[PDB]
Design a protein around this ligand. Sequence first.
Ligand SMILES: O=P(O)(O)C(O)(Cn1ccnc1)P(=O)(O)O
Ligand SMILES: O=P(O)(O)C(O)(Cn1ccnc1)P(=O)(O)O
Ligand SMILES: C=C(C)CCOP(=O)(O)OP(=O)(O)O
Ligand SMILES: C=C(C)CCOP(=O)(O)OP(=O)(O)O
Ligand SMILES: [Mn+2]
Ligand SMILES: [Mn+2]
Ligand SMILES: [Mn+2]
Ligand SMILES: [Mn+2]
Ligand SMILES: [Mn+2]
Ligand SMILES: [Mn+2]
Lengths: 345, 345
Amino acid sequence: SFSKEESREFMAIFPDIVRDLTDAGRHTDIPEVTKRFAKVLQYNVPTGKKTRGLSTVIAYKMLEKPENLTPENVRLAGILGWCVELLQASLLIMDDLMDRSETRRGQPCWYRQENVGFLAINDCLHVESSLYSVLRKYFSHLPCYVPIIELFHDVNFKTNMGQSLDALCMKDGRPILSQFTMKRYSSIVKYKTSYYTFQLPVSLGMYLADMYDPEQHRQAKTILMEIGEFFQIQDDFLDAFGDSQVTGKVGTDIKEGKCSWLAVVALQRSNPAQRQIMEEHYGRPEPESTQIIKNLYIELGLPATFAVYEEESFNIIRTHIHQISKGLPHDLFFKIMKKIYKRDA
Amino acid sequence: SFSKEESREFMAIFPDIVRDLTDAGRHTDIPEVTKRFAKVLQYNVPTGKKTRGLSTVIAYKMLEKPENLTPENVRLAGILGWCVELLQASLLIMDDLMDRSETRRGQPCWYRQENVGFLAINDCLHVESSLYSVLRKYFSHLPCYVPIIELFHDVNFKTNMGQSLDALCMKDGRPILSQFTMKRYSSIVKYKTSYYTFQLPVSLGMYLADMYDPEQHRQAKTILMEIGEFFQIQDDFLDAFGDSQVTGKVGTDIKEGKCSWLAVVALQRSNPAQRQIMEEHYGRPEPESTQIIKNLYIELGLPATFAVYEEESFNIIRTHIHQISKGLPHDLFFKIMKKIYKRDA
Ligand SMILES: O=P(O)(O)C(O)(Cn1ccnc1)P(=O)(O)O
Ligand SMILES: O=P(O)(O)C(O)(Cn1ccnc1)P(=O)(O)O
Ligand SMILES: C=C(C)CCOP(=O)(O)OP(=O)(O)O
Ligand SMILES: C=C(C)CCOP(=O)(O)OP(=O)(O)O
Ligand SMILES: [Mn+2]
Ligand SMILES: [Mn+2]
Ligand SMILES: [Mn+2]
Ligand SMILES: [Mn+2]
Ligand SMILES: [Mn+2]
Ligand SMILES: [Mn+2]
């Protein structure tokens, strides 16, 4: 699980996905566009950690009867994982535009690159639409096809709802601090991250294994929602405190006024002088105001607060995994937690 | 076809679509975003002329056997038409951002509204994803379900390719005039307009009528791509020469450096002096430059050229309809052609 050989097998599929989308004898009257789209895919799709794609394949191998794990079915799981990566890739291109970000995966964000700009918006829709072309090619004759397309449709819709709720942090260029509660936070991360990052890979593995029991999906969802919140809290910590040479990305939550876990906990922990600092300097374009907030986060001990939370939450999520039933493999959820716990990117 | 009673019938379905997407007992934990999404849908979806949605219904009524046209099946054709309007709505939200436009349908472009901006990209993705939720609710029990889903995803991909070819008119802040050929133009229009505007309504009517023969779809496509080319040429003409109070939108093609029909024909007709005016002034943000280009278009006689094209093309397409397979209803194509060209005869 998350091994050297699994990574190889997974990356080996990527050149076939590019060929399927750009060199399959289709659209031969517009080679300018298909050759460019091959570059959009090369740049934007395969340079992340690939945890979602690799989790799709691990979930399938842990759910399917061993007797059924052929080179072809394990390749189908890897193709589904790449369709999750195409969805991720599409969401990041949009997200970086919305967040006015500088870098992604160690490079300038796509929209910033020479002669891209507002062509990144279309490129995000194009990458999203491409995953359904991949699904059609490989899954259209299998019983899992309709369930899988419906799941991608539903997760997309839910992710959009979360992205909106996330964006509604600011009104008239000031953040709505009095509404930055843990209740709000948990709602945002459920929709903007947990469905597509955790629920979607495991549900896809289930469907490819012909597991359709609604209660089995519900029990997986309950735990994966808890994992997703934990994973987004880690992301938020990285925005302010991560090493951008390691994470690949420069943080923007403070400048953008976001209802991040750090903002919520800062408001919980602040004395009245510190609350006035949030009121005056949170969600401002000026570099000096963002550093004032970072310095408040340092003085509050948010790094240590996060570290204590992460350890406590890891243990609570594992306790919950142990309570799972409906015939689900505990080690699948244990492996997912081991991969992300104490991550620095 | 295209009467008030038919507009009446079609518009009555819209409030149900909004309820299906925002108030069907789902996502009850995030009313802030579902209430907001009802506003997104009200502003951006039902505010156009609804030609594509109405055309879906008319195609179904002309392709289905007369004995099969129940109120229930006609209502399903109307729901399919609203799914095309959701696709249109989504495309215009993103197009307006890419084209830096001011108005759409007589109101500010969505992105220009307070507290929208690049959140319009998320609302674009959300509106397109919605249509798959509508398809699942109403069509999932019919043979046509999968062909319809696939057509929507394939048309979206093709439209994205067309939008990218459209966008590549400029490189390094100057238009690539030497590549502005009628061959390039026709490729742009096929992909960015003709598939979703003309082919999609008719192929949807075919699928709801259980017409799956790819040859029948292909016979229709030949005519519909000719109508599409006229439709986009008219749109281009009006970008420069239309009244914005009538069109509902302020033109941006000259400033944006687009390979519009006007620019393509201007380069065809220009003497060397007139070509140097295009080289110096086309695709520039300065208002003097954009007025100099409009003056060159007047000097070249482009309004009269367009008027000749509108006459010549109408008579060519009518002649081509007469030659379609006796297997398809010629009057469907005549009705579509007459609506687009605003003719009763
Ligand atoms: O913090 P965000 O939600 O914008 C982020 O996690 C992206 N994202 C978008 C939706 N869910 C996650 P990233 O930090 O990668 O920029
Ligand atoms: O001229 P465009 O292609 O941008 C346009 O026709 C929209 N559009 C987008 C794709 N096909 C058409 P509009 O003039 O409405 O802004
Ligand atoms: C949901 C979130 C936190 C977005 C980034 O996801 P990752 O941190 O998994 O990014 P990549 O590996 O895909 O780059
Ligand atoms: C493809 C084109 C020319 C975009 C606008 O289409 P319409 O002129 O049909 O727009 P609405 O009626 O939907 O506003
Ligand atoms: Mn971001
Ligand atoms: Mn974001
Ligand atoms: Mn983040
Ligand atoms: Mn436009
Ligand atoms: Mn455009
Ligand atoms: Mn136009």
